[PDB]
Nucleic acid binder design. Structure first.
Ligand SMILES: [Mg+2]
Ligand SMILES: [Mg+2]
Ligand SMILES: [Mg+2]
Ligand SMILES: [Mg+2]
Ligand SMILES: [Mg+2]
Ligand SMILES: [Mg+2]
Ligand SMILES: [Mg+2]
Ligand SMILES: [Mg+2]
Ligand SMILES: [Mg+2]
Ligand SMILES: [Mg+2]
Ligand SMILES: [Mg+2]
Ligand SMILES: [Mg+2]
Ligand SMILES: [Mg+2]
Ligand SMILES: [Mg+2]
Ligand SMILES: [Mg+2]
Ligand SMILES: [Mg+2]
Ligand SMILES: [Mg+2]
Lengths: 251, 116, 229
RNA sequence: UCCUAAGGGAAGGGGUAACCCCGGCAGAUAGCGCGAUCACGCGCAUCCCCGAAAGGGAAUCGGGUUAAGAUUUCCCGAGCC
RNA sequence: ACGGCCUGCCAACCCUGGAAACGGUUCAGCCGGAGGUAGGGUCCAGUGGCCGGAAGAGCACACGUCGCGCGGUGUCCGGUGCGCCCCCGGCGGCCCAUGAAAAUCCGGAGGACCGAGUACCGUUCACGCCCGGUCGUACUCAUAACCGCAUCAGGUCUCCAA
RNA sequence: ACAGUCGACUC
RNA sequence: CCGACUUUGUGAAAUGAAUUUUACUUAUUCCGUGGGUCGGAAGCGGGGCAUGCCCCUCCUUUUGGCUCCAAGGCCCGGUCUUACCGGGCCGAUCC
């Protein structure tokens, strides 16, 4: 055979990320003394649309804690933020939509976004458009907390992980039908070369395990094992089940 | 300290003081005036330049520059150039149009060297 | 006077910008400094075996200074003075033809030579530097002097030994004989040094050193044991 | 010519049997800079070079002229950086 | 080209003033007690008007001189438009797409440190002096100068356009 | 709300 | 994918005559900064219903403003010696 598209995507040749107009990494602030042990006042200046990402970005202009200059930080906008708002960072930031607090300071039941995972890695969960994590519970004997991620999973995170209270903006975006291959194309230009996506069944055997045959069919079980060598692991990987999801399994 | 970054200190350096010169003999001037001004081109198209525009057309060493051309046109021929134009003619050598300040007369120089 | 006035800056957590204070704890050093600091830190954490931990037990300052006074009295010969001694015997050979030198008596040094003296038992006092790198060059001189019954001390500073002999290091010294005008001064020091090491080797050959954890780890220790008790 | 984009080459370092391969890995970083020398003080961020005769761009217009050059390259005039 | 003066579009901005009986305005929008209509001002574009450059230039005629002569006259006045090209202004629309970076330049915040008035410290002003280097530059750019073994109905990126 | 001049075009 | 050996040290109990469990930080591995405030002990307030001796605090919540290169205080030390320069500290808790 020959190397298969699922294998060709790891090269970087044409499949790299189309990031010429992206506005930079959207993440929190470098955690420091002031924001360990108090609050810092920063002011939003603009809500800028970040290309290739559904969530708006908020330019936040802090004042540098110990040198004399501004700090243009760049957050993932929580639905509610507006220009001119004061967002406060730290542990004694009041629980206001837009402020970022450690989880030691979010009462249980509260919605948060952009959750860090190792204290100071600047936000990894609940970041895409319109997704949030609920702080289910706390454990102060180990200094940890638990959250319900967007996926429906439940992760124990350090109680000093920061989080932006609220939910990410841009929610409800994936409800609108695109209705056009044109819309799909203009969606994927600014993310990466991953569209149009050709059915394997309409390929020749030399480039896809489903390929060939006087009719179009897979010809063998489309569920492949977890360990199958790269180039064989195409189809439905390590599937626990298939068919339309009914009943409890659809939870 | 004051800053959390250690930048490399300032040390002191001495200038090169060889115990033997690397090149003893003094280098002669090789783009001297006689290489730099080969011979005045004497086509009729240039002969017209001699009398219309008060200019002398030389052929100059290909590694010439306008500053050296004016300097050599002064040392030789004991004149000055108010402006030199240069072009590398397609056959390969460089050709220089040396316009004399209108104090000096191109006819006079052309007959002091013999062109016309 | 009246205009002169006080302007308090409120160096809070959002107040004015703090001044030029000391941040020496946090300065990101070169990798050379960095590694030579975790070097000694890791030698602290790890459990030194007794053979290496017989060091870190040095001569005390007072007896060290008393000893080094005598060592300075018996310094080896200068380059400046070693030309004169060979220059001025020229005449004693040329005219008298007879040598009138008596034995010049000075300290001995150098690891091979001192092991030679020690192993013949001509070494009347041994002084080993604690900080020889690689350590294996003197891991065994304490035991050698101990099992051949020669008084030894593990002094501090191989460079300070080197100064005695005019070298950049010395790493070992030993005395074989002293002037008759200072036997008593000598033998006052030998008994003390013997008492410190040639009396304690047979119980410090068993003690593991090291293991002294960090400051924050010891604070953890005292925090933890209280809440246990 | 200068600047950067997609992107390329590279000093220290890591790999490689070697050719070669990796550039953010963070290393007293390649460059130090700025006032100052009649010297010294201050800062050192995210830190090299290459890459467009269609992207960014210090400044020029008119009238003449040669067999062949120029619209603005020469000539007369008038400017500009 | 360039220099001075004048005008000042469509937007934006300032001052007086206080709007319902609602008004102002667009092809369309839209705007107004967060201050409209109104009166009066500022600024901005200009490839706009006048003057300098500049009629001496260029063209067109008319002569008369042998030989880049010389002489003369003119180089005016309005009106138009769903008109074509280039540009600019400002609206409106589309986006799960929001549509490059840097050099260079300008502006501002702060005010360490500085000086005279028989004289000394500045001055981003006017005028004045000097210098401006290296390489390309002819020609074709096509049913004959490029590629297709050719002076091959093929192919090859553009600007002007009665 | 009338008079003077002008007006390239469309129906 | 998995086991064993290896880098691989430190010490504790429970079962067996080696097994699963644990705790340490220094090897290691991941992460973060322009290596910018760590650990401990102080002190400033506030809860007091054993005056305990423990807890909760670190002089920014505020309206799209600005914040740098310290004012100030005492103590040294030179200087006209009858008028002016260099510094020790505190402000900025100590280890
Ligand atoms: Mg594609
Ligand atoms: Mg599909
Ligand atoms: Mg398909
Ligand atoms: Mg097919
Ligand atoms: Mg196959
Ligand atoms: Mg098939
Ligand atoms: Mg079948
Ligand atoms: Mg040229
Ligand atoms: Mg370049
Ligand atoms: Mg260019
Ligand atoms: Mg260009
Ligand atoms: Mg008005
Ligand atoms: Mg104009
Ligand atoms: Mg628009
Ligand atoms: Mg040309
Ligand atoms: Mg041409
Ligand atoms: Mg060919």
């Amino acid at each position: 055979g020959r190397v298969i598209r699922a294998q060709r995507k790891g090269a970087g040749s044409v499949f790299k990320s189309h990031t010429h107009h992206r506005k930079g990494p959207a993440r929190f602030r470098s955690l420091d003394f002031g924001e360990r042990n108090g609050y810092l006042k920063g002011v939003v200046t603009d809500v800028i649309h970040d290309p290739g990402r559904g969530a708006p970005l908020a330019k936040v202009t802090f004042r540098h804690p110990f040198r004399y200059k501004h700090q243009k930080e760049l957050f993932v906008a929580a639905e509610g933020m507006y220009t001119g708002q004061f967002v406060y960072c730290g542990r004694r930031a009041t629980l206001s939509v837009g402020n970022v607090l450690p989880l030691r300071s979010v009462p249980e039941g509260g919605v948060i976004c952009n959750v860090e995972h190792h204290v100071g890695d600047r936000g990894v969960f609940a970041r895409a458009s319109g997704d949030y994590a609920i702080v289910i519970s706390h454990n102060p004997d180990n200094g940890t907390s638990r959250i319900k991620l967007p996926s429906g999973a439940k992760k124990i995170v350090p109680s000093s992980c920061r989080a932006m209270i609220g939910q990410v903006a841009g929610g409800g975006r994936t409800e609108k039908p695109m209705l056009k291959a044109g819309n799909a194309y203009h969606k994927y230009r600014v993310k990466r070369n991953s569209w149009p996506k050709v059915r394997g069944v309409a390929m020749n055997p030399v480039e896809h395990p489903h390929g060939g045959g006087n009719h179009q069919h897979i010809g063998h079980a489309s569920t492949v094992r977890r360990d199958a060598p790269p180039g064989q692991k195409v189809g439905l990987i390590a599937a626990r089940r298939t068919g339309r999801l009914r009943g409890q399994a659809a939870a | 300290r004051t800053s959390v970054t250690f930048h490399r200190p300032k040390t002191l350096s001495k200038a090169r003081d060889p115990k033997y010169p690397r090149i003893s003999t003094p280098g002669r001037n090789k783009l001297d005036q006689y290489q730099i001004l080969k011979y005045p081109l004497t086509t009729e198209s240039a002969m017209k330049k001699i009398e219309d525009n008060n200019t002398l057309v030389f052929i100059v060493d290909l590694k010439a520059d306008k500053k050296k051309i004016k300097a050599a046109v002064k040392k030789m021929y004991d004149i000055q150039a108010k402006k030199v134009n240069t072009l590398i003619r397609p056959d390969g050598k460089k050709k220089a149009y040396v316009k004399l300040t209108p104090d000096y007369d191109a006819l006079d120089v052309a007959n002091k060297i013999g062109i016309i | 006077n009246p205009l002169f006035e006080k302007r308090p800056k409120q160096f809070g957590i959002g107040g004015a910008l703090p001044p030029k204070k000391d941040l020496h704890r946090f300065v990101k050093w070169p990798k050379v400094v960095r590694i030579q600091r975790q070097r000694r830190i890791l030698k602290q954490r790890l459990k030194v075996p007794p053979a290496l931990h017989q060091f870190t037990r040095t001569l005390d300052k007072n007896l060290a200074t008393n000893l080094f006074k005598m060592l300075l009295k018996y310094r080896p010969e200068d380059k400046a003075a070693k030309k004169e001694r060979l220059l001025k015997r020229a005449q004693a050979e040329a005219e008298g033809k007879t040598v009138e030198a008596k034995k010049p008596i000075v300290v001995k040094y150098g690891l091979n030579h001192v092991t030679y003296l020690i192993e013949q038992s001509k070494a009347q006092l041994v002084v080993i530097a604690h900080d020889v790198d690689p350590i294996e060059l003197v891991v065994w001189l304490p035991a050698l002097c101990r099992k051949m019954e020669v008084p030894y001390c593990i002094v501090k500073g191989k460079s300070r030994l080197g100064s005695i002999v005019h070298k950049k290091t010395a790493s070992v010294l030993c005395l074989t004989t002293v002037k008759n005008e200072d036997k008593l001064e000598f033998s006052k020091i030998l008994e003390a040094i013997k008492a410190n090491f040639n009396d304690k080797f047979d119980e410090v050959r068993k003690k593991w050193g090291g293991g002294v954890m960090g400051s924050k780890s010891q604070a953890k220790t005292k925090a933890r044991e209280r809440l246990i008790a």
